């Protein structure tokens, strides 16, 4: 018996086949870039105030003084959820009385907006918040939709695995790509809020599912050395490109339906890949469909120009491949021994906190100062050097000090936010981008570090548990942004404190660099 990576080693590590597969599977990750964080523009809240119908016979003075003024940022602004009793105002205006001259505005009665709201159109022409008035007593519905999107992503994480195992990688990939694109398109025709919410849940489910299927198919087709590069840089950078191009679209298109059309179109464009990506030969061998694997291997050999006679490859060996011992599935293994128990708890908390920080910072961009589109672009762009640095650090430096430093930077920088004087408000944006830089580096590194910490017997299970923890964290991530209304800096204080505690935690994990990866739990490294 032999190994699949050995039997197939004759194809080489790099060449026309593996190159095309690498850049096509990576290109299929772009739509997840602008689909993941489109909520920053689809669910944005413009400035708004109570609407006063023009039927009111109010003087120009009264029309200038129809809403109480409240102070924000040290500056007067119309109160966004309350107005002076329109009937009392109309009675005063009919009597000839005028504000200030005859009326003390400070003691008038107030009511909520019974004629709806007037949203400004300086930035957004329309969004779902303006469509269904998700403001004042409905404001909690705005982040809820985003939480529900990540809820769908959670469910997709469970389902896409089993589906891909039972029906293949390419089939699940393209089916869920089409599902995501179709439900993204359908959302344009949402009559009311509930249909939009449920369609957004399904869109997130499809998005996660097809990301996962692309990742698994790529890490199964590519060779041993290029596998790491694909997993680490290949998909991350093209996700960053998708995110970076999201604000480019949102700048020209400022209507949520036309923006959904624009973000839907690339998904339809990706369907051409069906004729270029083959099914994973390793999976087909797992199902016992050896003729299809043989055909795909011979086609790859022909594409790379390698002569493949019986002396260098034969299906008889293909039919007698080795199978690795099956890994434990019962979760009890992760809790049976004290050391692995503690390592699992720390990894859960580390992944959840890194995810909360990353998605909170991503979703908080429209609340920063300066141009919203420039801020979103800078947020998307600061990830590419974060991935390059993460990759170099993983290649050459111990994981513990690297991740302690990246988290310490990401957390400490945020705590400085409250110390920036308003005159130099732009420094706060600098800090926030450096903050997200650190978080992004840590987020890229943990995917590898955790996979090294667990022994083979349960490695996948442990990684999956920690990954689910991170995904749970992003359900909470839009609510930390929601807290920005109660107190501007509270979200950053929370994120910074939690990140510093996570950076302190990381130092207690055992070091893996430069040591053989363990095979059985008895060989697992001990926590400090
Ligand atoms: C930060 C880098 C390493 N990622 C490529 C990792 C973690 C975040 C980012 C994107 C990806 O994680 C996701 O969950 C993706 C695809 O499901 C996602 C992006 C945006 C919204 C929801 C999910 C995997
Ligand atoms: Na995709």
UniProtKB/Swiss-Prot annotation:
Changing residue 210 to S: In CDSP; loss of carnitine transport. Inhibited by emetine, quinidine and verapamil. The IC(50) of emetine is 4.2 uM. Not inhibited by valproic acid. Transport of (R)-carnitine is stimulated by cholesterol in the plasma membrane. The chain crosses the membrane at residues 21-41, 143-163, 173-193, 198-218, 233-253, 258-278, 342-362, 374-394, 407-427, 431-451, 463-483, 489-509. Changing residue 240 to T: In CDSP; reduces carnitine transport to less than 2% of wild-type activity. Changing residue 175 to M: In CDSP; carnitine transport reduced to less than 10% of wild-type. The keyword Cell membrane applies. InterPro entries: MFS_dom, MFS_sugar_transport-like, MFS_trans_sf, Orgcat_transp/SVOP, S22A4/5, Sugar_transporter_CS. It comes from the Eukaryota. ATP binds at residues 218-225. Changing residue 46 to S: In CDSP; carnitine transport is reduced to less than 5% of normal. Changing residue 151 to M: In CDSP; uncertain significance; reduces carnitine transport but the mutant retains more than 60% of wild-type activity. Changing residue 75 to P: In CDSP; carnitine transport reduced to 2% of wild-type. Changing residue 231 to F: In CDSP; loss of carnitine transport. Belongs to the major facilitator (TC 2.A.1) superfamily. Organic cation transporter (TC 2.A.1.19) family. This is Organic cation/carnitine transporter 2. It comes from Homo sapiens.
């Amino acid at each position: 018996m032999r190994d699949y990576d050995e039997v197939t080693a004759f194809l080489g590590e790099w060449g026309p086949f593996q190159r095309l597969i690498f850049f096509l599977l990576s290109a299929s990750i772009i739509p997840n870039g602008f689909t993941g964080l489109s909520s920053v523009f689809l669910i944005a809240t413009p400035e708004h105030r109570c609407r006063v119908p023009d039927a009111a016979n109010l003087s120009s003075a009264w029309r200038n003084h129809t809403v109480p003024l409240r102070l924000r940022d040290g500056r007067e602004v119309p109160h966004s959820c309350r107005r002076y009793r329109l009937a009392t105002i109309a009675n005063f205006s009919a009597l000839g009385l005028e504000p200030g001259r005859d009326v003390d505005l400070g003691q008038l009665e107030q009511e909520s907006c019974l004629d709806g709201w007037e949203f400004s159109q300086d930035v957004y022409l329309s969004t779902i918040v303006t469509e269904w008035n998700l403001v004042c007593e409905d404001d909690w519905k705005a982040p809820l939709t985003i939480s529900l999107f990540f809820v769908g992503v959670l469910l997709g994480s469970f389902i896409s695995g089993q589906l891909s195992d039972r029906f293949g990688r390419k089939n699940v990939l393209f089916v869920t790509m089409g599902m995501q694109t179709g439900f993204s398109f359908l959302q344009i025709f949402s009559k009311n809020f509930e249909m939009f919410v449920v369609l957004f849940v399904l869109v997130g489910m499809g998005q996660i599912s097809n990301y996962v299927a692309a990742f698994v198919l790529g890490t199964e087709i590519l060779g041993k050395s290029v596998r790491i590069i694909f997993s680490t840089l290949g998909v991350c950078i093209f996700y960053a490109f998708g995110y970076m191009v999201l604000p480019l679209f949102a700048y020209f298109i400022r209507d949520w339906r036309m923006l959904l059309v624009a973000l839907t179109m690339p998904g339809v464009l990706c369907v051409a890949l069906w004729w270029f990506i083959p099914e994973s030969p390793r999976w087909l061998i797992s199902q016992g469909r050896f003729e299809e694997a043989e055909v795909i291997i011979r086609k790859a050999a022909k594409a790379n120009g390698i002569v493949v006679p019986s002396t260098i490859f034969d299906p008889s060996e293909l039919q007698d491949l080795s199978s690795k011992k099956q890994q434990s599935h019962n979760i009890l293994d992760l809790l049976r021994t004290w050391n692995i128990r503690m390592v699992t708890i720390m990894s859960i908390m580390l992944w959840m906190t890194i995810s909360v920080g990353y998605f909170g910072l991503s979703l908080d961009t429209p609340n920063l100062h300066g141009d919203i589109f420039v801020n979103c672009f800078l947020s998307a762009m600061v990830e590419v050097p974060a991935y390059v640095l993460a990759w170099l650090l993983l290649q050459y430096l111990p994981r513990r000090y690297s991740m302690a430093t990246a988290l310490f930077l990401g957390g400490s920088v945020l705590l400085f936010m409250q110390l920036v004087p308003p005159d130099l408000y732009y420094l706060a944006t600098v800090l926030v981008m450096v903050g997200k830089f650190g978080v992004t580096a840590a987020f890229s590194m943990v995917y590898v570090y955790t996979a090294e910490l667990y022994p083979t017997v349960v490695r996948n299970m442990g990684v999956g548990v920690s990954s689910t923890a991170s995904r749970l964290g992003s359900i909470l991530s839009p609510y930390f942004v929601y807290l920005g209304a109660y107190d501007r800096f509270l979200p950053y204080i929370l994120m910074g404190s939690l990140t510093i505690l996570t950076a302190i935690l990381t130092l207690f994990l055992p070091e893996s660099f430069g040591t053989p990866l363990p095979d059985t739990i008895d060989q697992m490294l001990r926590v400090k």
